[PDB]
Ligand SMILES: CN(c1ccc2cncc(NC(=O)Cc3cccc(Cl)c3)c2c1)S(C)(=O)=O
Ligand SMILES: CN(c1ccc2cncc(NC(=O)Cc3cccc(Cl)c3)c2c1)S(C)(=O)=O
């Protein structure tokens with residue numbers, strides 16, 4: 001019993017964090033094999049013009065109390081790749097994957113190449129993340145684990161004026177319509193991840209919280225008409241299919257759980273809580289709920 | 299900016315998790331130097347659990363009865379002893395991944411990270427607090443016994459909790475790393491219930507200071523209170539009494555924001571009376587009590603927005 005916001009064990013990622021310094025700027029880098037990946041804004045814009053003026057010895061890479069030797073450098077989108085002389089002996093089995101909004105991942109927040117905390121979060125539908133980052137956290141990474149393979153999905157680049165965060169995948173492509181520069185940028189109007197709220201309502205049922213269940217059902221179209229009015233993302237037939245296992249385990253059909261969500265949206269919680277929360281939680285995917293209510297290890 | 303429930307990086311603890319098997323029971327152990335620490339109930343059958351005599355059950359065991367597995371490597375048990383409710387298995391190999399560590403016993407209200415494990419394999423990490431009733435609101439399934447709670451302040455891992463059991467309400471009970479239970483619990487299947495739980499007042503106040511540091515002031519008011527009047531109101535909402543020690547501990551946050559502790563106590567009194575009225579504080583519609591004053595200072599900036 002119990003339901004917590006749970007992150008993946010961070011050990012395989014901790015063994016990859018390094019400190020990257022260029023001039024007066026210091027941030028974090030990800031050392032995999034003989035390459036250190038970090039935000040290209042470490043050289044700060046015309047990034048190609050700024051990069052051509054830098055030599056290998058300008059980039060100081062520190063792995064713990066050991067200085068790494070930069071033997072090459074190249075840029076891929078908004079990510080700088082520093083070729084080093086030494087391959088990381090702690091390099092785990094890994095992939096670079098781009099995630100979609102609604103998907104969740106763990107963030108290992110770092111300062112000066114030293115990991116300080118791990119938290120779980122979701123890629124919002126507006127492509128921002130509601131993280132917890134201070135100055136010096138640039139280069140901190142987001143990841144998931146599949147068996148023994150670490151899938152790197154996010155690298156932190158900046159904070160927006162509302163306190164939310166923007167970053168790229170590990171190939172340097174930003175999530176969202178953001179750019180790596182000091183300019184007027186704002187996060188779009190955010191929406192609630194509907195498939196994730198439904199998964200969390202299934203997790204509440206599994207944990208013995210059934211007060212919100214009702215005898216009613218709904219059509220997918222009527223649910224989407226109601227959901228669009230509360231700034232909830234549309235629920236597709238794919239989402240319904242993905243909720244299949246949880247629906248079969250609890251005995252509550254997905255459209256039956258949608259009618260519960262409709263009543264919660266139109267009438268509120270009425271002083272009650274679900275899994276210790278007075279708000280509808282959308283940062284647990286259907287897979288996160290199955291994994292936490294099954295005991296999958298890494 | 300931003301405020302998340304943040305756990306310590308778990309790498310230093312992952313390198314210590316092993317699987318301990320005795321008969322048909324399998325659970326987790328913590329391998330530090332040449333000793334594996336695990337719940338002593340690993341020697342019990344489900345029948346033994348009502349009234350087990352651990353001394354009587356342990357004297358019947360030999361070293362080769364305990365199977366310890368570290369990854370895909372079998373460790374050799376060369377000795378065994380019981381210290382309170384933990385079993386200490388002396389092994390023939392020191393863990394090369396042993397971090398710098400201490401065993402610390404925590405007080406209610408204190409927070410820590412939990413590395414939940416099954417079969418000696420870590421599956422997840424979360425942050426939680428020792429409730430005033432000495433239970434933890436964890437997320438544990440069968441096989442999680444032996445999973446540990448820790449803090450990593452600087453480079454030293456302070457182990458503070460080892461998971462032993464789930465109570466009928468779904469909450470969890472465990473010991474420090476010296477085998478002493480937190481709370482009036484016993485490692486027996488006898489009728490045991492968690493006492494009435496209360497809100498950790500000093501932690502809610504710390505979290506209201508974190509909200510002010512992050513630019514939110516909607517809940518503040520022009521009032522102050524005496525410590526006694528605050529406690530009379532707080533106890534009516536099942537909030538722990540705020541002691542002068544708690545007031546002293548909130549000193550740094552009070553000086554950083556410019557809001558006196560008893561003035562923040564007055565905002566808390568008002569929040570309990572009024573509710574939130576459709577508003578949130580740090581993305582939460584409830585008053586959060588699982589961030590200590592130390593967690594807020596560690597996570598938040600030194601410059602108030
Ligand atoms: C220095 N400060 C912070 C605070 C939290 C921060 C959290 N994450 C990243 C930061 N870094 C940038 O956003 C740098 C930047 C600026 C423009 C374009 C890019 Cl791509 C990158 C953060 C900076 S403060 C208190 O707001 O003055
Ligand atoms: C109710 N069950 C669970 C579920 C979550 C559990 C979470 N943590 C620990 C468990 N183990 C015990 O509590 C074993 C025990 C029993 C009595 C006294 C002690 Cl010291 C230890 C858990 C057992 S189940 C599904 O039937 O396996």
Ligand SMILES: [Cl-]
Nearest residue numbers: 403404405408
């Ligand atoms: Cl303590």
